[PDB]
């Protein structure tokens, strides 16, 4: 156990306030990425995830991204970003 | 590449744990070693920081800011 | 796996099938369950739970069968069956469903026991008190060594939706008697006795 057992925990009023909205991506940054996306296209691995996504092979895509990036959160989120391109097509 | 120990005839005599010449990896990065190489070449200047500018199969290139 | 498209195809087949269709919904529904991941040496073989039928019984069970009109017979033919091995097979092949008598089951264990066991069709003993018709209503999941699995969904004229429920009940049971379950099945088709296959 990592917490002391006090049933009446709460002797002082607590001002827990992160007072923070989730960090906004920011409109200007999205615009700069759009200009770069036109100039640079997409990385070879991203195109291969898109081809696996165009065919219905989503587990293959997640496994290929998890090998490419090395973290499930960023593998899933890359699969869901690149899927918009294939879904738009 | 990876560090190769400077042992003559490629043999390190001693406890077998300290054996091994070709498999060792550098302690400092190739960014740090680039910074240390220019510092010897240019002892008078003061090294600020370095940035990576290119990489090939055999070589890696780092550009160092040096201040007079 | 929408039931309606296939059920509607069976309803369209009511005009299309025609055929002799004795006691049938214009056809006897059949299912060809394709299997992937199936090996003969690997053992996923599970023998687990209108066609012509026979009941051989004593007093009351035969009398109820007589009013129903279901076949009613006696143990006397078992000496004649013993004379002709082919005759025991002839009795078995003609009547797809076999029923006997609990009271006369001693006769069915020795007099009928060898030929009917070799044939693989066993009469189901029905005592006079017991009702044969309700047992007949009760009248299959098998894997054997064949990847293709074939079973008559329903020889009944019962609505295609009731027939669809019978297909569903066996598919889930097959998923239970399969290592990868639904994954193991590949392609299944529904067709009328002379009708075209329609993938599920």
């Amino acid at each position: 156990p990592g917490k002391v057992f006090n049933l009446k925990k709460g002797g002082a009023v607590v001002r827990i306030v992160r007072k923070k909205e989730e960090r906004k991506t920011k409109p200007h940054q999205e615009f700069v990425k759009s200009i770069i996306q036109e100039c640079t296209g997409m990385a070879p691995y991203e195109m291969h995830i898109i081809e696996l996504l165009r065919m219905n092979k989503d587990r293959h895509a997640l496994r290929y991204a998890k090998k490419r990036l090395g973290n499930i959160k960023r593998a899933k989120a890359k699969r869901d970003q690149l899927s918009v391109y294939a879904r738009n097509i | 590449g990876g560090r190769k120990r400077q042992c003559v005839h490629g043999i390190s005599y001693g406890k077998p744990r300290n054996i091994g010449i070709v498999g060792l990896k550098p302690s400092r990065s190739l960014r740090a070693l680039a910074e240390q190489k220019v510092g010897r070449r240019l002892p008078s200047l003061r090294v600020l920081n370095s940035y990576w500018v290119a990489q090939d199969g055999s070589y890696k290139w780092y550009e160092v800011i040096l201040i007079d | 796996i929408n039931p309606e498209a296939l059920n509607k195809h069976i309803a369209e087949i009511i005009e299309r099938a025609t055929n002799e269709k004795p006691r049938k919904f214009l056809e006897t529904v059949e299912l060809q369950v394709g299997l992937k991941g199936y090996d003969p040496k690997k053992d996923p073989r599970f023998n687990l739970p209108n066609l012509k039928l026979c009941v051989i019984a004593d007093a009351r069970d035969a009398d109820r069968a007589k009013k129903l009109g279901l076949n009613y017979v006696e143990i006397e033919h078992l000496q004649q069956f013993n004379k002709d091995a082919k005759q025991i097979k002839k009795f078995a092949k003609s009547y797809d469903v076999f029923l006997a008598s609990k009271s006369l089951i001693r006769q069915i264990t020795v007099y009928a026991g060898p030929g009917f066991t070799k044939a693989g069709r066993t009469p189901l003993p029905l005592a006079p008190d017991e009702d044969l018709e309700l047992k007949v209503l009760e009248c299959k999941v098998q894997f054997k060594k064949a990847v293709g699995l074939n079973w008559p969904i329903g020889n009944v004229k019962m609505p295609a939706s009731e027939i669809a429920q019978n297909i569903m009940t066996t598919l889930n049971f097959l998923a239970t008697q399969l290592k990868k379950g639904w994954q193991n099945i590949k392609t299944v088709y529904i067709k009328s006795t002379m009708g075209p296959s329609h993938r599920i």
């Binding site: - | 077998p16 744990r17 300290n18 054996i19 091994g20 498999g23 | -």
Partner: protein, 93 residues
Amino acid sequence: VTYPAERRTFCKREGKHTVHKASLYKKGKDSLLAQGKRRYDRKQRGFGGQTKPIFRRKAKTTKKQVIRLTCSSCKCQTFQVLKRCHRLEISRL
């Protein structure tokens, strides 16, 4: 030595003597994810050669055979260690 296919023995879950099927116990394959195996693969990682003793002086010719008695009713699993023996068979049903 011949062991019977079924022996009636006490099953702890039921708490009563019940019929138990018999079956030879075999050591399972070693898991890479084990306290010792994780430590051993780290110790043997790198230069220095073997870091752990490798026994090479076998002397026992026989092992001790454990029979897994599995109760049909409670699925209780009990193990009976027989005396060391060169050959063992479990009678068929």
